[PDB]
Amino acid sequence: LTTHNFARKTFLKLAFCDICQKFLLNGFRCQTCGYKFHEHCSTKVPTMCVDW
């Protein structure tokens, strides 16, 4: 299945790291589900991206 996806790219306007607590900046967002976060959430992420 298409697991998580990571493409280093800046967003369009503004976002928010659901893992941390404040906005999201040019980091890593999954372009298949629409996930977004910094390096604190590359491995700390528990359930990988397997939504549907």
In this structure, the dihedral spanned by the alpha carbons of residues 48, 28, 18 and 23, taken in order and rounded to 10 degrees, is 180
Q: Does 28 bind Zn ion (CB under 5 A)?
A: no
Q: Which residue is nearest to Zn ion (CB)?
A: 30
Let me know how many helices (H) and strands (E) the chain has, helices first: 0, 4
Query: Of 13 and 52, which has the nearer Cβ to Zn ion?
Result: 52
DSSP state of 14: -
The residue ranges that bind Zn ion (CB under 5 A) are: 4, 17, 19-20, 30, 33, 35, 37-38, 40-41, 49
Mark the binding-site residues for Zn(2+), compressed into ranges: 4, 17, 20, 30, 33, 38, 41, 49
